């Protein structure tokens, strides 16, 4: 019905035709273009809303679509004869008619301004996630700098975090190299982000095994609180790190050299479902059934008053069960919840909405586990006054 909708149908199906491998694909796309052209022909472009429906402009507008439908039918005849290449070549000539007959009626005084307003919004969203990730990066760089090299260093919990934070810092930095290189002999830099896109998919799944570790070593460790093994789990600590590398790295490094295109590799279906969608789904599934037993045993400690309102075990509990569903579900909606291709206008809205939450991802983890823990806040203020005292006595020495 709406002209922009039919106009989008025409553009996406041109793309379908351009990338088609057989006549049936071309035929189906041309069919959708014909139907779209027929609908658009009955609409009123913005520049002619004040004009009469019988105006010479509206008659010109409608004749352009008669020409287009004519060319579409010519391309259909070719596709129906199995002439894929000829039909594809014919489809490339539609843009010529659209530009000369219809394009002059969409770009008017008001509509040529919207073009820039929409443009400064996508470039604002471009820094809006760049800022998110830079702060998310900096948070984790600071969160690790305080936990690393301390009396916290003697903690094993403050290591299964130090790596969880290391998985989000590897990702955020990879995204700022993709973002950076995508706006800059030349192949000495063009292939430079290709090796960087590796770490991003690597550290995109990795931030889900470390999210598996946090869920299990609340259960297997604090949940049970009866088993002697606790520190010797390094055999499954920085080894859990291995699953988002083993069932990812070949499924993307070998599948890339097979069908490589741009820096940020696009949907290959067979390629990426095996690459990252495999271990991220394996991790979010088994993290739910442990989570529901976590709360099941947590409420048992209410009447028994074991895990008290001020227990260190209970603090970690109201911070890890706050990161297993929030982070888990919203980055599960990411792959397939609104799984229909639909159109580009509605597709980008999903992408930009996922990029916004996916940017400030490592900020909230750095806050929940590091900057919000009460024994972390205290040791920090302890050594601050001791350093300050240190400086005072140092000035007295000389």
Curated annotation (Swiss-Prot):
Phenotype for residue 322 to A: Loss of synthetic antagonist binding
Source taxon at top rank: Eukaryota
Resulting phenotype, residue 133 to A: Abolishes expression at cell surface and glucagon binding
Effect noted on mutating residue 319 to A: Strongly decreases affinity for synthetic antagonist
PTM comment text: Ligand-binding promotes phosphorylation of serine residues in the C-terminal cytoplasmic domain. Phosphorylation is important for receptor endocytosis after ligand-binding.
Disulfide bonds: 193-263
Record flagged with keyword Disulfide bond: yes
Localization, UniProt: Cell membrane
GO cellular component, one term: plasma membrane
Membrane-spanning segments: 121-145, 158-182, 195-218, 233-254, 273-295, 320-338, 351-371
Region of interest (Important for allosteric inhibitor binding), residue spans: 319-322
UniProt keywords, alphabetically: Cell membrane, Diabetes mellitus, Disease variant, Disulfide bond, G-protein coupled receptor, Glycoprotein, Membrane, Phosphoprotein, Receptor, Signal, Transducer, Transmembrane, Transmembrane helix
Effect annotated for changing residue 273 to Q: Abolishes glucagon binding
Extracellular compartment spans: 255-272, 339-350
Task of the protein: G-protein coupled receptor for glucagon that plays a central role in the regulation of blood glucose levels and glucose homeostasis. Regulates the rate of hepatic glucose production by promoting glycogen hydrolysis and gluconeogenesis. Plays an important role in mediating the responses to fasting. Ligand binding causes a conformation change that triggers signaling via guanine nucleotide-binding proteins (G proteins) and modulates the activity of down-stream effectors, such as adenylate cyclase. Promotes activation of adenylate cyclase.
Designated name of the protein: Glucagon receptor
Organism: Homo sapiens
Species classification: Eukaryota, Metazoa, Chordata, Craniata, Vertebrata
């Amino acid at each position: 019905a709406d002209l922009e909708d039919n106009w989008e149908t025409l553009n996406d199906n041109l793309k379908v035709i351009e990338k088609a491998d057989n006549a049936a694909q071309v035929k189906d796309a041309l069919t959708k273009m014909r139907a779209a052209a027929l609908d658009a022909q009955k609409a009123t472009p913005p520049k002619l809303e004040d004009k009469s429906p019988d105006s010479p402009e509206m008659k010109d507008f409608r004749h352009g679509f008669d020409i287009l439908v004519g060319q579409i039918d010519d391309a259909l005849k070719l596709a129906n004869e199995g002439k894929v290449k000829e039909a594809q070549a014919a489809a490339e000539q539609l843009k010529t008619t659209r530009n000369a007959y219809i394009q002059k009626y969409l770009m008017d005084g008001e509509e040529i301004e919207v073009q820039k307003e929409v443009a400064k919004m996508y470039s604002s969203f471009q820094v809006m996630y760049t800022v998110g990730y830079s702060l998310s990066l900096g948070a984790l760089l600071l969160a690790l700098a305080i936990l690393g090299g301390l009396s916290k260093l003697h903690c094993t919990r403050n290591a299964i975090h130090a790596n969880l934070f290391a998985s989000f810092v590897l990702k955020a930095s990879s995204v700022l190299v993709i973002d950076g290189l995508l706006r800059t002999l030349s192949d000495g830099a063009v292939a430079g982000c290709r090796v960087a896109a590796v770490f991003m998919q690597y550290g995109i799944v990795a931030n889900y095994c470390w999210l598996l570790v946090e869920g299990l070593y609340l259960h297997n460790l604090l949940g049970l609180a009866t088993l002697p093994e606790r520190s010797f789990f390094s055999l499954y600590l920085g080894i859990g790190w291995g699953a988002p590398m083993l069932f990812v790295v070949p499924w993307a490094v070998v599948k890339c050299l097979f069908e490589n295109v741009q820096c940020w590799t696009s949907n290959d279906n067979m390629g990426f479902w095996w690459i990252l969608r495999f271990p991220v789904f394996l991790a979010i599934l088994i993290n739910f059934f442990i989570f529901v037993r976590i709360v099941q045993l947590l409420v048992a400690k209410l009447r028994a008053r074991q895990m008290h309102h001020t227990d260190y075990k209970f603090r970690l509990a109201k911070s890890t069960l706050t990161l297993i569903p929030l982070l888990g579900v919203h980055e599960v909606v990411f792959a397939f919840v609104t799984d229909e291709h639909a159109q580009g206008t509605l597709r980008s809205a999903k992408l930009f909405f996922d990029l916004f939450l996916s940017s400030f991802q490592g900020l909230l983890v750095a806050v929940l586990y590091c900057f919000l823990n009460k024994e972390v806040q205290s040791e920090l203020r302890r050594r601050w006054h001791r350093w300050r005292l240190g400086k005072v006595l140092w000035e007295e020495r000389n």
